[PDB]
Each structure stands twice: as C-alpha cells, then as structure tokens.
From Swiss-Prot, chain E:
It comes from Escherichia coli O45:K1 (strain S88 / ExPEC). This is Small ribosomal subunit protein uS3. It comes from the Bacteria. One of its GO terms (biological process) is translation. PANTHER family: 30S/40S RIBOSOMAL PROTEIN S3 (PTHR11760), SMALL RIBOSOMAL SUBUNIT PROTEIN US3C (PTHR11760:SF19). Keywords: Ribonucleoprotein, Ribosomal protein, RNA-binding, rRNA-binding. The keyword RNA-binding applies. One of its GO terms (molecular function) is rRNA binding. The gene is rpsC. Binds the lower part of the 30S subunit head. Binds mRNA in the 70S ribosome, positioning it for translation. Disulfide bonds: none annotated. The keyword Ribonucleoprotein applies.
Length: 99, 110, 83, 100, 208, 151, 127
RNA sequence: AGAACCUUACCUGGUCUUGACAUCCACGGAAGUUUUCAGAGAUGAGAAUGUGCCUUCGGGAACCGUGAGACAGGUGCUGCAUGGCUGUCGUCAGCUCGUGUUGUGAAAUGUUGGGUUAAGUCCCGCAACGAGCGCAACCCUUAUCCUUUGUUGCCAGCGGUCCGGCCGGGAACUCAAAGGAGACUGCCAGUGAUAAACUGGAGGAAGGUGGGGAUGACGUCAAGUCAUCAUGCCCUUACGACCAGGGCUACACACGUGCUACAAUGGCGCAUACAAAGAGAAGCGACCUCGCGAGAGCAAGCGGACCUCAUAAAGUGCGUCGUAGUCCGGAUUGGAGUCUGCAACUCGACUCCAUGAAGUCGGAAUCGCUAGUAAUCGUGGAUCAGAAUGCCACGGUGAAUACGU
C-alpha cells in the first residue's frame, strides 16, 4: 500500500493538497484509504525583543507543522504513475512510500 | 487554452530559433487544442522538447488529472537539433466566447 | 584528574627538552610555559623555570614533585595582604 | 560582530571540513580498547599535532546576517533580534506570534 | 517600544507570508539565508524600479521569485532581456533553478512601502519633509485609502535636537486584527543622519 | 475587596463521616497541598479522641471546637492619635474557622511526637477546658472585655 | 443494550459504560478498591450513584486515561453522570442540583514569561 | 538561550602591515591535492600532480603569489547628533481633531451634568454637531456538542488466543485535526427616569468580558542600547590583523535574586499506582552483556501519534528510626574514577568510598499570591562537545481568606 505523508505550515493549503491527491488517486485506482490527520507539531520559540537589555520583554513565536496521512490500498499501473506529472502546490512537502 | 508562456519571447509577432511555424501560427495551433481536466478548474501544463522533428500534442508532460485527447495534434516543427522550446500553457474552464480585448482589463489577478 | 587509560600529560616539546638536558648532564634552567605538563621521574634534579603569566620562576624538581604538574609550583596571583 | 571575527569563524569551519576524516579516525583509534598502547599514544600525539581550528568544538554559532555570538537560534541560523525582524516581515515561513 | 508590528500580528488572518515554503529543521536555516541573499540582491538592483514586495516560493528544488513592482517596464526592460539576466543571478545566489515572475502593482500611492520609499527619496534630495508627508497622505486619500498614517523621525531639517512628526488622515485601526493595514518602513540617509519613515495604509476590513 | 462581594466556593464533605466542618478542618491542617496525609492525621486524632472521651468521633470533635470558639474578637480602628482596639461580634462562618485554626496552631506548637497524637491531645484539652487554644480564646475575649467601652 | 457517558476533568478522560446488574465497578480491569487507593476518590466516583439510588441496580465498566488520581476520579464521576442522563433522562434535575452535570473547566493556568509560575511574581525590591 | 580552548571584546609576550575580511589593475603561477624540519603556535624553509571553458595567438574567467597605491579594518568616542528596537507610568481609560459657538486673548465648549459600566461602556439631558486614536469586538487557546476522516491512535460488541489490542476485525468510545453549532442579559421576574442598566433564576458544558493569552492610545523619563544591526570625530607599521598562555572564575567585606536545609504533615528501606508537554540524524539510542555506580561494549527501531530520550515524583501499603545537632542536614575536604573535549592545573559535569560545617524556623524590617491561584511534587525544551539551583514551557496534588474601605 502507498502511504503518503503531507507536511505543511499552512493548514488550509495542506487540506487543499490532500483533496487534490485524493482526486488523483480515485479516478485512476480504487479504494483510496482516506485523509487521516496526525498530530500537529507546534514548535515554539521564545526570544528577547530588546536590542540590549530587558529580559521580561519577550515574543513567543511558533511554527505549526501539520501532518496529513493519505494511504492508497491498491496500487494499479495507471494510478501510481499519475502523481509523477501531478505536482502539488508549493509549501507542501509530500512523502509517498509504497509498502 | 487561455495564456501561453514561451521563454525568451518579447511579443507574439516575433519569431523563434529552430522552429517552422511562427508564433502566431503556434498560438493558433494551441487555440485548437482539446483538453479534458477532471478535478481542478485551472491547471498549468508544460511542453519541453528538443531535437529535429515535429512537436505533437503527445509531448506535453501531463499531470494526473489532465487528459490530452488528441495525440496527433501538431504544434511546432523543430528543425535545428540545438533548438529548444519550453512553453507553459494555462487552461481555464468556462463557456461561450471570451476574447482577448475584453479579457485585457477583466482579468483581476494582477 | 586525567583518566588512567589516557596516561600522564606532558607537552611534547617540553619532554624533548628534558631528554636533551638529561643527555647533556647540564643544570642550566629551562624556561618553560607548559604549566599543564606533569612532572616525570627523569625531570628530578633539573631546574625548570615555569611561567606564572608574568615571569619564569625557577623550580628545582624533587622526588616528591613527580605526580604533580609544573603550574602547581609557580603561583600566578600575587596577594600580600589587605593592610 | 566584526568582519575579522566572521572571517576567523569561516576559517575554522573550513578547517573542520578539511580535517574531519582524519580527526575522527584518530579519535576512534584512541577510543578502541582492543588496540596497542604505543599506537594509542601515537594517535594521541598525532591529534595534538593537527591544527586547533580543525576541532568542531572550537567554532561558535553566530548569526548568519550580523555575526552576533549570543542569542542564537539553530533552526533559523539567526540571532534573536534578526529572527524577530524576519518574523515581523513575513520572511520566516509559518512563524507567527503564539498565544495559549 | 510600545507598538506591535502591524504586518506581524496579522500573518495568520488577513496578511500572508512573503517566503512561502516548507522545510525540515535541516534545510530551513540555509533556505532563510538564501532568501535573505536573493532579496538583498533584488533590492540593490531594482532600487530605481519601484519595488514593493519580493515573494519567494520554492517547490521541488527550484526557486520561484515573484517581484511586486509599480513599473514592470524598467524591471523587464526589453521583453525578456532584463528578467532573464536577473534569473541566472538569482539561481546562482540560491544554487538551484530560478524562476522570476513580475506582478504589476496597481495604485503605487496606496502601497505603503512604495510611498515610504518615495518619501525617503524626497528627503534625500532636500525637500521640506512636512510637504512630502502631506503629499503622501493626500495622494493616498485621493486614490481611495480608507485611511493612511505616515511618521517621520530624527534630524528633521538638519536640526540638532531630533524629533518625530506624523500625519494621519481617515481611520487607521491597528488593534483591529481584521483590518487590512499595509505597514512598511524606510530610512533616508541624509547629510545630517538617518531619517526613518513609517507609513500605515488602511485598505479596509476583511469579512470572513 | 472594593468592587464586589463573591459567593464562597463549594467544599466537599469528608469520605469517612460525611461532614463539611471536618473537611474544612482537614484542609486547614493540610500543608503543601498534601491533603491525603493531613486527612489521615485528622482521622487518627479523631479515633484516639473518641477512645478517650467516648461519645462519637464527630460529636467529641464538635464539643472540643465549642470550647475554643470566640463570641467576640477585636480589630484596630486607630481613628485617634493612638490606636484603639475595638470589639466586634464575630460571625458564625468565621468563628468556627478561627477556633479550628487556633487548634491547629496549638497542635503545631505541642511537644508530643506524632502530629496526629498532638492534635488529639489538643482536642482533649479543649473538651476539658485547658490547653493552648482555650487560653488563646480567653485572651481574645479578655481583650474585648477590656476594650468594651468602644462600640 | 449498555448505556454510555464520556468523562472529562483536568487532563483525564474516563469512558464509563452503564449496564443493568448487581453493582460491581471495574476501572481498567481492576476493582474500585484496587485502582483508587484513596477514599475521597472512591466517594467521588460513588457520589452520583448515591444521589440517585441505583448503586445495587447497575454494573459499570470504566476505562480512564490521563491526569492524576483526583482528576481521574472526577472525570469518572462526570462520565457516570452522563451515562445516567442518557439512560433515564428524568434524573437530570437532581444531578444539576448536586453539581455533577457541570464539566469542571478548571485547567492548570499556563506559566507566563516574567513570572516564576501562572501568577507567582518574582521577589520585588525597591533597592 | 550557557566564559576551559574557542567565545573575547581584556592582560602578557611572540608576530603581520594594502593587510584576517572586499573591489581594482599590473604581471609571476592553473586552482587544489598530498607530505618534511624548526617553532608555544602564528609562521618560515622542502618533495609530488595538473595546464579546463578560447585565440587575424599585445591573452583571458575561476584560485594562489608579489609590489604600488586608491582603500580595507576598528566590540574606538558621542544613545546629550540619530534610525531601529526596548523598558516605563499602564492594558491605566484616557488623548485629540474638524466645523460651529463663547471669550480682547491664553483658552473654553465638545470631553461637563443625572444615572450606569471593567471601560470617554451605554443611555438621558445639554452650544454643540460630528470624527479619529484608544475601550469593546475581530485573532490564538481553553470548557460542551455535532459532522467528516480513522493510522502509527482507539477497543464498545463480535470470534480466536502465547491473556499483550496482539490478530481477524470493528468503526462505536477516547484521541487526533479540519469544518460547523453554542452565550447574546437572548428568555423570566423585580428595581429603575416610559431608560441605560442593576439584582436575582430558568435553562445550559459554560452567565453576564465564561478562564487564560496576544493586543500597550496621545505622550512621559535628552529612560536603555553607537558592543546585534544601521547611522551623522578619532586611529591607520596601529585604537587594525594572527598566535600561544593567562584573565573575565581573583576575595577583609556589603547588597540583590535563587536552591537546600533546620526535620516525624519527616528521614531511610522494600513493594506499588496515576501525567502532560516536548526533543531527536556530526542526533535520540531499546534490548542483551559487563561495571557497586557515573558509564562501557555490542547494536536494533526511528527525520518519528510507530522507535528512542523515558522509570514521572509527590502519593499508596508494609517495616523501621522516637525529638537527639539525630538514621535531621548536607557544606567542606581526602582518595579513586567516568564522560565530553587537541586539552578539564588555573576552571567542567557526573559517579563511588570516606569526611559530616553552619543550621533547632531567622533583628529591624520586607516580598508574592483571590483558584486549579498560592503552596508543594516531579517532567521537558532552548543555548549546548561538555557545562543550570537560571530562563522558557508541561502536567500532578492542591489550600486559606476577602467583614469591609
């Protein structure tokens, strides 16, 4: 089975990507597993915002890396190849893995 | 076909290195194209080819949800083996007839 | 202290100098900056003027000084008293 | 930071890049309990001979824009001050002010 | 240092990011550095061309730049001569295949950054700062800004004691997150010193 | 506070006897949010006390409490140049609390070994009308009496 | 046939199932006395049942995750209450009166920059 | 958001001077690759390979070498020349403007007054009428529900069992995200000026801003920062650059902020239960073997809801100690060692064995906190080779009190 790991910072974008991938899968092949949402990584950062000194002065940023696990149960001839030409939107790191 | 983007081009009335049809001929032969998308409503294809011989429509590096149903539609006739052509087509979806003059200011997305 | 498996530490150059001295049988003081160098059995008898940051202070090596380092016998700070 | 400091850092990095294979090998030799004493000694001495700037524990992480040694972040390669600026500008992707 | 950055507070809601890519902790710093480089280069090059926003977007080991500029003609030059030139240098800077797009900025009086730049330029060529500020404000208003504020600070008219002066017109709500507040800044490197120019331009509120 | 009076928060009755007062006492006793240990101690105190005086566990405790509750406490107005301590009638909710607190203090003070044992002893004393808490109560009363002129 | 209610309190998440029976409580394949060593916890889990005389009438299978002991107990209680509500739907008023239907929304307040804790400010001095 | 070296800006010596870092020509050499002796090292002297993209051949672009200067360089001075960024009063409810009107005018009015509010919040009046910046709302998070999607997450009901959700499976539940619903004084009664509101109650997961965060008006302090950065006199064979060693860790003393204690609500021993949130490829490193232990060896699983860090601790049960400077307390010092690292002397952390200071709740005075708060218990992260009792995060247990001004 083809496991697909979508990773992105924007959630909407990721969602869009996932849908597209599903569409790509579903026309060619059959029995797409589904878009399973894994836990989001909220990598936080604190920094001092003064140039020199004021330690209680701080900004707390974060990067929300979202995960989408799409799986394809039956890899056909037509389906797997379809993704080669079918590149997804920018800012979405995909990671296909058969078996 | 709505917008055609050829590399190393200034306007549509120029000419290019290594081809037969001129650029107005290429735009007419691209206006005759027959595409069938499934999921999206606006896609971008890619055509890249070098070498002596005609450029069919079957040489476009397709994505998954686009289907080019005329694999003998000719576009160019590449004559020089050192010549290349890399155009990026944009395929919308609508109805009726919307021409270039009205679509000269209608287009909002700068 | 240093690990037993690693052995004792002595600066290579310093060691060489010591060897040379031994060969000679001379007793002129060897000015040295290697304060981190451990003292060796063969170094016994030699005067070796160890740097203290500022100046080289003469250290006549003894049987008791072997396990120790050269910087132990060359104090850097110079405090007499507050009054 | 100064230009000079930056240059020094660069040099150090270069040295590290150069001498990695040898240094690592030497380290391995030194570690290896199933080995000769003399060999080990040689290795130890050999290491000393190699340049100091060849060590990776010599090089300090500085900001890639300003060269500021302190307040550094690894993910961005930038000092806090610059990082913040980047965030404000939209230049770091995904990064926005966090509240919870 | 009272105020929060108006762009920065709104990135999740009404404002988008400039650099728009994903990368793991491994390649992220490098990417950032590259972005910084390319942007810097672009600024250096297209100073005379009125450039507002460089948007970098890298998918699949290939960098896509998008230059928002008021006059494409000077950035493009002859059709695909200057752009092409820019591209290879961009690629070099990055170390990947480059692709430059050029967005045409409609209404450069309403783009805040551009306005700021203009003001700075004016300052440099020894105009009355106040008159420049007025012009900036007025023009924006005319163009259909719901509001605009501009602020200039330090060594105004080469005076020994530095001060800040600012002109607002219309409404410029900063606490309101859903307000499209185009904020940007610039610096006039005059004979007496630097003169920092801030400008806030309120396009309107977004409803979603 | 200035602006608004607020409703006292909900307190659960203890699992052994099903009493609010007991629970409150336990809470008072507690330190570092170690409730369980404190409650155990309280239980121990009760049991020993029960053994000593007969009656029930709860009833005895109540009786003990009764002998250390203050009718009247004092507060410092100080309107003049020197300070005047003024008596005030101390309300039902507060009086109960105060007695408990005093008892706890006494227990803490006491020279016996285990905490629970000490507590038990204190309770016994209260019941009999000798000890530390009782003394404190008397003192409080005495002060009030002294300053009865102010009202 | 088995009825159900979800329990939640602090970071705990109980899964209470109500069935008709004799009144044996199992929490993660362990008895009430085994799982909760604390009496208070036991009391809290039995509270709702005590309030509406169905202690002997119904068995309940529970599995709980997250939080500590007291929190877990609370969650369990909540779950039980929910189950009861589902099952009868005429005991709601009593439950409301008790204060068991209410999800106790008290979470731990986050630590805040500047402060050592949620509210503890560091030691101040003019000099 | 981490001084052994480095960092480093300081000291001591040893050295360099178009230079460590750039651009420019001139012309000597392809770059680079390997190795040798002296030296603390910086540097100062040797042996091997190569000639790629192009020439009506006066040669070129990358990358070393030498000399000239143009210049580089400066964590040098001025934060009282500046920008930017920051603190602060203060998340205090304020601060203004246009037009009108009043006053010779500075100014006033609006913005005051009656009520009310967390709020210049809202209503009513009124020479004001309007507007803006702020007080509110929009944003994140947390509390309830529903829909969607179910692996690496889950196990209600089914069968099988090595009694492990592990394996058939199931999509219920938890959980995971994505999208919706929900709270508005909307509904009820009373008080109120026919009001804005207030007081209570109904429902509800939540009630009157539900809890928390982000958000900081005009301005103030010639507040802080020229040593992040940028920027408007001074040094330029040295106030620049390279190096090794030392110092920033000094110690009659005074203050600030913390940790650990002084014990029995405890210490010690044995058993045993319940978290959250994070990090991880020059990385996290199971299992197994060895070591009293720090660790060592071997070495899977894993860019990770999968594997690893990783046993939560307080707690609970049973035993012991019995108020002692103690089976409290752990400083200090001796020995021996482990790991990181060219390198632990100055000056790392941790381990083992020994040693066992002061300290029995702290003078004048003084700080924090109104709830999942304080108090207490552990856990993680950043910087980081190594080096936290600090900082930033996470959950566990979990109070007291608020009469009032």
């Amino acid at each position: 089975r083809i496991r697909i790991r979508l990773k992105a910072f924007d959630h909407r974008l990721i969602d869009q990507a996932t849908a597209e991938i599903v569409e790509t899968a579903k026309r060619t092949g059959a029995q797409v597993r589904g878009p399973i949402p894994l836990p989001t990584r909220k990598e936080r950062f604190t920094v001092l915002i003064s140039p020199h000194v004021n330690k209680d002065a701080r900004d707390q940023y974060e990067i929300r890396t979202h995960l989408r696990l799409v799986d394809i149960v039956e890899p056909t001839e037509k389906t797997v190849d379809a993704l080669m030409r079918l590149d997804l939107a920018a800012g979405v790191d995909v990671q296909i893995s058969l078996g | 076909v709505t917008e055609v983007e050829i590399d190393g081009v200034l306007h549509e009335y120029s000419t290019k290195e290594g081809v037969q049809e001129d650029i107005l001929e290429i735009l007419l032969n691209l206006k005759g194209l027959a595409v069938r998308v499934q999921g999206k409503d606006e896609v971008i294809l890619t055509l890249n080819k070098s070498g002596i011989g005609p450029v069919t429509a079957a040489d476009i590096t397709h994505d998954g949800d686009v289907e080019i149903v005329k694999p003998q539609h000719v576009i160019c006739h590449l004559t020089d083996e050192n010549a290349s052509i890399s155009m990026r087509i944009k395929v919308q979806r609508g109805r009726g007839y919307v021409p270039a003059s009205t679509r000269i200011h209608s287009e909002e997305d700068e | 202290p240093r690990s037993l498996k690693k052995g004792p530490f002595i600066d290579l150059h310093l060691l060489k100098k010591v060897e040379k001295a031994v060969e000679s049988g001379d007793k002129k003081p060897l000015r040295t900056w290697s304060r981190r160098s451990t003292i060796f059995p063969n170094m016994i008898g030699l005067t070796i003027a160890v740097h203290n940051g500022r100046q080289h202070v003469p250290v006549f090596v003894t049987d008791e000084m072997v396990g120790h380092k050269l910087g132990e016998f060359a104090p850097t700070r110079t405090y007499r008293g507050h009054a | 930071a100064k230009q000079s400091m930056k240059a020094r850092e660069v040099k150090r990095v270069a040295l590290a890049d150069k001498y990695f294979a040898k240094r690592a090998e030497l380290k391995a030799i030194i570690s290896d309990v199933n080995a000769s004493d003399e060999d080990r000694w040689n290795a130890v001495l050999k290491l000393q001979t190699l340049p100091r700037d060849s060590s990776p524990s010599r090089q300090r992480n500085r900001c890639r824009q300003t060269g500021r040694p302190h307040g550094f972040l690894r993910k961005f390669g930038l000092s806090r001050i610059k990082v913040r600026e980047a965030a404000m500008r939209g230049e770091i992707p995904g990064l926005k002010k966090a509240s919870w | 240092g009272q105020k929060v950055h108006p762009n920065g507070i709104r990135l999740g809601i009404v404002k988008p990011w400039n650099s728009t890519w994903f990368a793991n902790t491994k390649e992220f710093a490098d990417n950032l550095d590259s972005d910084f480089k390319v942007r810097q280069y672009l600024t250096k090059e297209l100073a005379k061309a009125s450039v507002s926003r460089i948007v970098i977007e890298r998918p699949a080991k290939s960098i896509r730049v998008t230059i928002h500029t008021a006059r494409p003609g000077i950035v493009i030059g002859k059709k695909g001569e200057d752009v092409e030139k820019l591209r290879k240098v961009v690629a070099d800077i990055a170390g990947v295949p480059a692709q430059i797009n050029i967005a045409e900025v409609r209404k450069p009086e309403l783009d805040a950054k551009l306005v700021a730049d203009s003001i700075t330029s004016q300052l440099e060529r020894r105009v009355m700062f106040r008159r420049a500020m007025k012009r900036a404000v007025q023009n924006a208003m005319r163009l259909g800004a719901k509001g605009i504020k501009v602020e200039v600070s330090g060594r105004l008219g080469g005076a020994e004691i530095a001060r800040t002066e600012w002109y607002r017109e219309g409404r410029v709500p900063l606490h309101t997150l859903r307000a499209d507040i185009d904020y940007n800044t610039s610096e006039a490197h005059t004979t007496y010193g630097v003169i920092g120019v801030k400008v806030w331009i309120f396009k309107g509120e977004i409803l979603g | 506070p200035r602006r608004r009076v607020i409703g006292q928060r909900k307190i659960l009755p203890d699992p052994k006897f099903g009493s609010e007062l007991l629970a409150k006492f336990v809470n008072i006793l507690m330190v570092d949010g170690k409730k369980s240990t404190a409650e155990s101690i309280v239980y121990s105190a009760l049991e020993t006390l029960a053994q000593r005086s007969g009656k029930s566990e709860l009833e005895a405790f109540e009786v003990a409490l009764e002998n250390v509750r203050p009718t009247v406490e004092v507060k410092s107005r100080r309107v003049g140049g020197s300070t005047y301590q003024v008596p005030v009638e101390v309300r039902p909710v507060r009086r109960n609390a105060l007695a408990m607190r005093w008892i706890v203090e006494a227990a803490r003070k006491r020279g016996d070994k285990s905490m629970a044992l000490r507590l038990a002893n204190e309770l016994s004393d209260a019941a009999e009308n000798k000890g530390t808490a009782v003394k404190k109560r008397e003192d409080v009363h005495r002060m009030a009496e002294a300053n009865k002129a102010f009202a | 046939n088995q009825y159900y209610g979800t329990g939640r309190r602090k970071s705990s998440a109980a899964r209470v199932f109500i069935k008709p029976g004799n009144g044996k409580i199992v929490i993660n394949q362990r008895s009430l006395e085994q799982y909760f060593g604390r009496e208070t916890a036991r009391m809290v889990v039995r509270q709702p049942l005590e309030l509406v005389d169905m202690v002997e009438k119904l068995d309940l299978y529970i599995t709980v995750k997250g939080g500590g002991i007291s929190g877990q107990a609370g969650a369990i209680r909540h779950g039980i209450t929910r189950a009861l509500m589902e099952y009868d739907e005429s005991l709601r008023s009593e439950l409301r009166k008790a204060g068991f239907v209410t999800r106790d929304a008290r979470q731990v307040e986050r630590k805040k920059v500047g402060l050592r804790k949620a509210r503890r400010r560091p030691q101040f001095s003019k000099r």
